[PDB]
Each structure stands twice: as C-alpha cells, then as structure tokens.
Ligand binder design. Structure first.
Ligand SMILES: Cc1cc2c3c(c1C)C(C)(C)CC=[N+]3c1c([nH]c(=O)[nH]c1=O)N2C[C@H](O)[C@H](O)[C@H](O)COP(=O)(O)O
Ligand SMILES: Cc1cc2c3c(c1C)C(C)(C)CC=[N+]3c1c([nH]c(=O)[nH]c1=O)N2C[C@H](O)[C@H](O)[C@H](O)COP(=O)(O)O
Ligand SMILES: [K+]
Ligand SMILES: [K+]
Ligand SMILES: [K+]
Ligand SMILES: [K+]
Ligand SMILES: [Mn+2]
Ligand SMILES: [Mn+2]
Lengths: 496, 496
C-alpha cells in the first residue's frame, strides 16, 4: 500500500528517506520518549521510532514521534508532510495546502467497506485490557494524565447517519477503561456530541483510530466544512476510495490498516478530570485541571507490532504548528475567495505561534473595489472571525503582492513597517475566542470571546493607484545586470 | 593606536580577525560598491574594503562597507561591533550595551587638543575640490543623490560653546561645494541648529568627520542626553581623553586620526532638494524629494590613502539596525530605571525592523508595586514615548523574567502568546512619531504624531503572586537528569 494510504508504509517511507531514527534499546514512556521527540521538534531532526518501549506487552505498542514535524534542510523542509499526501518531498507549502484544498471542488469519493484488514490482527475485550497498564506516554512533566491521544482520529457520526466526522482532539487515560479529553465548541466532535445530547437517548457511538492513513490524519486536522464527511473528502483528494472495516462492537467504520483502534462510547452525561497538557502555544499551567468529556473503551483491536504515533507538542515546531496552523490558513484562503475577497494565499506564521494568519491580497483586484482600509478590514474580519475556520486565529495580517506569506521574515517585515498600530487595525471583541491561547484562558478578559484583530499592512496606494516604493534590498535596489555581475564575481572576490 | 580609538587601526583589526575582504580591482561607486555591501549585510558576510574605486583621485577615497554589521557565526555575531569598543569579539549584546551606558555614571573626560594629526596629511581648499568629481557612491538605484554621508559624524556646537554634539545624520552631494541632508526634530543637530537660527546672526559652524574613532561613531549613533558632549562621554567610556585637532577654517575640533574631514557651515536660512534614500526600514519611495538642510563645504582635509566608511542600509541587517535600534534600546533601559521602573534589559528586535523595543521586567519588583497592566503600561509609555530616546520606537513590549529580550524568537513568542490584542495594549496618539517608518510618513495618519503602543506581554499572575506556568519545551518540561541523559545519548541514538 502506498505511504499516503497506510501508516505502516509511511513509516517505511520515512526510513527509506533517511528521515527516521530507529531506537531499539528500551525507552521509558514516562517522559523519555516525549523528551527525545521534543528535542527532535525543536531541532528539526529525524523522526524517532521507539521500537522498545518499557512496559510494552499484549504487543502494544511501539511509538513514532514527530510524524508531521519539519526536516532540517530548506529544500525538503516540509517533506514529512509531503509524504502524508503522495507529493514530492520538495513540495512547497503552497503545493501542500493546494492539495489539501483540492477536494473542496470535487465530488466526494465515498469509502469502500472491506471485510477485514490489518487492524483486526489482534483484539482485547473488556476483560483483557487495562489502559493504565499500557505504555501510554507522559508527554510533559506537569501533565495531568498520560496522553494516549495526540495523533489519532476520533470517529463520530450524526444521529441521522448522514455525517461521519474524523478529527484530532486530545485525550488522556482516566482509568482502566475510560479516557477523558477536550470536546469544545465549535469543533465538529462537539457539534455531533450536542446532537446526541439533544436526542437524549444514548451515549455517542465512538471509535479512535491511531496510525491511520496519513492522508486521513491530515484531513482530520483541517476545518473542512460542517456536515462534510472527511472520508469522502480524503477519497476525492487522493483519487481513491478509502478502504474501511466495521468496528466489532458498533457500526462505525475505521481505516482497514489502522495500527490501533479503540471502540466505545463518548458520554452524553459524564465528565472527568482532564488536563492540564503542554499545548500548542508552548505552555502548561500545572494543576489547571478541569472537567472534560469522558469516553468508555469496550474493545481494542490492533496490528501485529502496532505503532502509536505521538505529538510531543509545545514550543516550535511540531504537528500543532505545521498542521493546525497551516490547514486553518488553507481553509481561510478558500473561505475568503468564496466571499469574493481578493486573497491569493494564506499562511499562519510559525513565528506567531500560529496565532496569526497572513493574507496575501491581489492588489489589482483590490484597486478595482475602490474601497478603504477601514471597510476592507472590517469585511475580512467579519468573514473570517465569524467562521469556524477562523477559530484558532487571533490576528489577520493583510499584505500586498510583494510579500511571500510562507516566509515569516517577510510577514514580520510587512507587519512592522506597513501597519500603523491602532489606526490601521480593527479589533473584534464580539467573536468567538480561542481559550487555549494563554492571553485568553489565563488572561485578563473573557476566555471565550474577543481578543481578535485585523492588522492592515497594505500601504495607502495599494488601494488606489498601485505600489509606490521599491525595497531597499539587493533584489530591488540594483539593476539586473549588476546583480548578476555581483553574484558571478562573489566567490572570486573572497566572499562565501 | 588601538582599534577603538583609530579607524585605520580598526580596519587592521578586521583583517587580522578574518572579517575583511580586500577588493583591489576597480569597483564602481555608482551602485556596485553598495550592491556588494548590501549583499554582505543580507548574508552576514565579511566587511568589504574597496581599495580601487573608479574615479578615485586627489587620493580620495577608498570605501569600507558594512562597518557595524553582523558576522555569520553565533559565537562572534556582534564582533564588529565589539571591535568598536575594545571588547572581546565574543561579547554579548548585553555587554556591548552596558559598555555604551557605562559613561552615564561617570564624570566626563574632556578631550585633549593636539597640534596635528593624520587627518591633516592632505588638504583641498575651495578652488581645488569638487564634491561632484569625487567617487561618492550611489547607494540605491532610486536615491535622489550620491550619499557621501552614511557613517561620518557631524560636529556642531551650541552658540554659547557649552555643548558640542557628535551625531550621524544622512547627507548627499548638492553641488561642487554643498550637501543637503536630514536635520529633523528632536535630534541634537536640529536642536543646535534651532539655537543658531534664534540667535539669527550666522550660519552654524560645522564639520563632518568620516572614519572617526570607532568608539566615537558608536556614541554618535546613541541618544545620550541633551546637553551632553559626546567627546567627554566617549572619553569616560574608554577611560582615555580623545585627541582632537582644530579645523583650519573654524574653531571646531575633530578627531586627530579622522580619515576625511569636511569643514564649513550648516545654513540657518537655505534648503535644497534631499532624498529620497533607501532607509533603515527597508524602503525607498522614488521621486519623494523634499527640502532638507543645506551645508556649505569650505575645506577638505584627509589622511593619505583615506578610507570612507559606508552603510548600504535597508533590509536586515546593517548599521541602522545594529546601532540605531540597539543604542536607543540601551538608553531606554536606563531612562526606565531612572524613572523607578523595574526594567532590567531592553533590546530592539531585528525582526521588528527595530521599530519595537522589548523591556524585560523584574517581576519581583513589579509584584511589590501592587499595580495593574493598564496603569503600568500607561506609566511606561509616558516615560518612554515622551522622551527623545523613544523617538524611533513605536511599540514597547513588556515581558517577564523568563524572556531573553536579545533573542527575537523569544520576544515573538511572548508577544504572540501573552498579549491580548486591544485589551492588553495602550495606544498613544499624542506623542511624537517617527516619520521615516512607512506607515507614518507614507501612511494613513499624521506623519509626525501618534502611532505608538505599549503591548503588555506580562501574564496576570506576574503582577500578583508569580509565574504560574512552565514552558512546554525541552528545557522546562523535563527533569534535569532526563534532559542530560537525552543529550548524552543523542549522537549514540542516531541524531545530529
Ligand atoms: C494536529 C493536531 C490537531 C489538534 C490537536 C492536536 C494535534 C496534533 C493535539 C492532540 C496534539 C493537541 C490538541 N489538539 C486538539 C485539536 N482540536 C481540538 O478541538 N482539541 C485538541 O485537543 N486539534 C485541532 C483540530 O484537529 C482541528 O481544529 C480540526 O479542524 C478539527 O476537525 P473538525 O473540523 O472536523 O472539528
Ligand atoms: C547608525 C546611523 C544612525 C543614523 C543614520 C544612519 C546610520 C548608519 C544613516 C546615515 C545610514 C541613515 C540615516 N541616519 C540618520 C540618523 N538620525 C537622523 O536624524 N537622521 C539620519 O539621517 N541616525 C540616527 C542617529 O544617529 C541617532 O538618532 C543619534 O541618537 C543622533 O545623535 P543625537 O542624539 O546626538 O542627536
Ligand atoms: K477535520
Ligand atoms: K497600512
Ligand atoms: K549622539
Ligand atoms: K498580558
Ligand atoms: Mn469535520
Ligand atoms: Mn547628542
């Protein structure tokens, strides 16, 4: 099976790329595996595969850390991500996000049911497992639990059967047969939970699949529209129907080659302690436990030699930056274009801890609108900040065509030099806020509302007659023939 | 003579450091010298010494580009700057700025007059030179003139003789015996000019010295207080009285080892076209010429084999970032401490195009103030933004003790995660603005007023009971003994 369609094959691909380190000596799931992975993410090193976990048994489990993190070279920086999607390892971010958006203008390709797959090679019923005995990692020293779920996909379906959602949301072990986790608005797992809670008759049938097809975990991390079944989006994206097998204890369907599958229920009534957790913005507040959603686990199925992927998330750079930020930016680009806004590109700068999105504007199109900064900021912010795709994003930065939004140095340069504080900005207090950002949930104002801004880094003439400056840089302040002469004589002269 | 006291010796030091490239083949002052220098600054390469300028004659002049720019290695990043100050080349930015501040609590050491020096080796009277025939560079393709003055020191004295100021301000050739340049409030050259203009009797006696003692050009770039003679500050800083020789045509005094000296007058009545110029924020607006101050040149004196230093300024990183930003930050640190504010460190992040200063707060001291964000922002912004030291700075970012303000990644992380837009900020519209920033002089509002902000990236408990988080990073989220084990086994395991 190809890498993008089978996690086991993806691990192979990473080896074969010289993008993996296999670690066959014992590694402790209590902090050591995550510490090594954290170091990898902070240095853009090779992904670690821990083949010898302490306390590995019933054959559960090996760990792959840093599955969606960065490579060291500029040329294949995003190669791990490219390998989720059948793209060349030199793919740019534009090409990755275009791939992720491509299915938004295609018919879904619904999944194919098959009778069995590798995820059925082993099973443990509810007298045979104990989640507290498995080698579940402690990821950060102050975490409030062992976070089994950092890179699996939750599967829940609307009561009417018409929407099956796949998404990533964190969860930790509560006791031998339960998890607790985040289930928060406006996320689709929360929207579906609310439908079951309003019907009032039963807990939500649920599955959590770990080590799913890479192309599926990428869609699981993307805010595709309400009501859209990720399986059919991924089918369209990849050009192929995904093969799914039915759960044994419910009627949900899981990828056939899933490494590990939990089957059970998400309660419509019960909660339990959840968190704290070292999170995407780089923080943990020790002791900050709150009531989260509760999950019952009835059955585990798994591949021979199962591998659990793990995100050791926090400070730059990991899956919470490369996937959450970039995939939200992608969806925001599309949303703006569908609202008739002249946005060509969007990206969440890593330097902003993926709390900003830079929007590149087609300024010929903007000029034809015959508008102003105040009006345009206002229009962009209403579209984005009132939509789920904008949930995680607190600052939008509008930039003209000269800026490469995929280059954070250029975004920072534009923001710092073209946006006058206050006057060139519009604050939005009456929109949903992302409480996970420290300045929101641990800050001076409402945790769930406001704190958003549109910062216009378009210069005045970009709305009227066109750009009226040149950069004071090598590229723009010298003619072509001089530039080339300099470059041709560079090493001759003594330079590197 | 030591490097910090004699520019010729500084050039030697750079060679000897393997921090110079000598270029002995002909180089055109029309754009080529500046293009090579621009490339150096954008790549942190070795400083270029152009020993064979096209149109070099009456022995005027060689050029040294990038005199205060960055080196490639992290370990001696600031080494060129250290070599201005007798500091080791591995000096940190803290150590450089402390050196620059050290004289603020010392008696001045006034300069010593000597009868002659190297700057008298050659002379041209006002029938012998022509500024349009010298190899003055065109620095950026769209500049409005050939900017002779990018790294020399203007010397002007108050009418009463009690204050002699040394400062860098740009100037370009107007005609055979005149320059035009920036002379703008609140700068000291402007304050002194105003005193002469109010007296109304004569033009300002003036000299412009190029290739001055390195320690002197650093003080020339720093906003030391009103009324303080830079020569005596530099004397105190260096522990030695500077040797000065009298001008031939006026009673000003110039460093004895100056490479090139212009003597003349700064008009109290006449102006001439000035600019545009590719500037510190990275821009040029072609065609944007305005009336600037006018200077008459009566005499040139110069060293044998004179060397003109040149800043090819623009996008990161050059003297306008390393010196303007950092030296303003230094003075702001001191100003805050003298106003009883608990600021330990200040730096202007390069990533902000030196338009921000990050202020590190001693949060034990802040807690004892028993104050709030609104009040503290307000107090900091009034102190800084109403003072000349704050002129160039439009955003102050307050951070707690865990942040290294000399590390722009950490400043950005703190700003993006700890400062809620709007609520955690105070805008300042009724303060002097820096018109050179594009969003000011070419923006939507008043060019000279407002556009400033204090952004509080202190978290709430930093005002009350103390920091309540740990970072989700390798350093903070894992115990010491684990961290060391990981590091000790890193290359063993397969990592770099
Ligand atoms: C890549 C990724 C995405 C996480 C995520 C993580 C990763 C690695 C973790 C597990 C390491 C840390 C926490 N995560 C959560 C999360 N969304 C959320 O609601 N709760 C979370 O706990 N997300 C974001 C979420 O997957 C996206 O917002 C999706 O758009 C949700 O899918 P949906 O649009 O179908 O609701
Ligand atoms: C290092 C440096 C500093 C420049 C400077 C440049 C460099 C290389 C140039 C020449 C390349 C570009 C323009 N510069 C100007 C300038 N200040 C100003 O008033 N006009 C300028 O044209 N400065 C900043 C100025 O030197 C500081 O604000 C000093 O504090 C001024 O001294 P003062 O406090 O005695 O007035
Ligand atoms: K999803
Ligand atoms: K603007
Ligand atoms: K000065
Ligand atoms: K704050
Ligand atoms: Mn969804
Ligand atoms: Mn001064």
């Amino acid at each position: 099976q190809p890498a993008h369609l089978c996690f086991r094959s993806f691990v192979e691909a990473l080896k074969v790329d010289n993008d993996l380190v296999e670690i066959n000596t014992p590694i402790d799931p209590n902090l050591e595996a995550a510490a090594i992975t954290r170091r990898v993410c902070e240095t853009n090193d090779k992904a670690p595969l821990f083949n010898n976990l302490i306390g590995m048994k019933n054959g559960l489990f090996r760990i792959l850390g840093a599955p969606g993190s960065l490579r060291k070279s500029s040329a294949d920086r995003y190669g791990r991500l490219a390998r989720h999607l059948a793209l060349p390892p030199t793919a740019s971010m534009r090409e990755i996000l275009d791939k992720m958006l491509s299915a938004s203008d295609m018919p879904p390709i619904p999944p194919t049911i098959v009778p069995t797959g590798p995820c059925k090679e082993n099973s443990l019923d509810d007298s045979e497992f104990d989640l507290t005995e498995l080698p579940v990692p402690l990821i950060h020293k102050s975490d409030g639990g062992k976070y089994i779920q950092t890179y699996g996909m939750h599967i829940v379906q609307s009561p009417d059967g018409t929407w099956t959602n796949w998404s990533i949301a964190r969860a930790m072990v509560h006791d031998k047969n339960h998890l607790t986790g985040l289930v928060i608005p406006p996320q689709h797992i929360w929207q579906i939970h609310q439908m079951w809670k309003k019907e009032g008759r039963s807990d939500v049938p649920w599955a959590l699949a770990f080590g799913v097809p890479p192309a599926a975990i990428m869609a699981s991390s993307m805010p595709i529209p309400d009501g859209v079944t990720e399986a059919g989006y991924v089918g369209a994206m990849t050009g192929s129907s995904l093969e799914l097998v039915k759960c044994d204890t419910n009627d949900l369907y899981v990828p056939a080659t899933s490494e590990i599958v939990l089957e059970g229920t998400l309660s419509i009534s019960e909660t339990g302690p959840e968190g704290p957790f070292g999170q995407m913005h780089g923080y943990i507040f020790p002791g900050d436990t709150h009531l989260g959603a509760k999950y019952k686990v009835n059955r585990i199925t798994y591949r021979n030699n199962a591998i659990m992927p793990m995100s050791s998330c926090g400070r730059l750079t990991d899956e919470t930056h490369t996937m959450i930020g970039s995939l939200a930016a992608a969806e925001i680009r599309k949303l703006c274009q569908q609202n008739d806004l002249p946005i060509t590109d969007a990206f969440a700068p890593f330097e902003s801890q993926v709390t900003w999105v830079a929007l590149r504007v087609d300024t010929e199109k903007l000029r034809a609108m015959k508008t102003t900064s105040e009006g345009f900021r206002k229009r962009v912010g209403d579209v984005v900040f009132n939509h789920k795709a904008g949930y995680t994003i607190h600052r939008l930065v509008l930039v003209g065509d000269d800026i490469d939004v995929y280059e954070g140095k250029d975004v920072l340069w534009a923001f710092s030099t073209r946006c006058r504080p206050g006057m060139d900005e519009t604050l939005f207090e009456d929109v949903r806020g992302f409480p996970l950002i420290p300045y929101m949930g641990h800050g001076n104002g409402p945790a769930h509302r406001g704190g958003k801004v549109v910062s216009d880094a378009l210069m005045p003439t970009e709305y009227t007659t066109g750009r009226n400056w040149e950069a004071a840089d090598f590229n723009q302040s010298y003619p072509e023939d001089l530039k080339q002469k300099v470059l041709d004589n560079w090493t001759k002269m003594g330079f590197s």
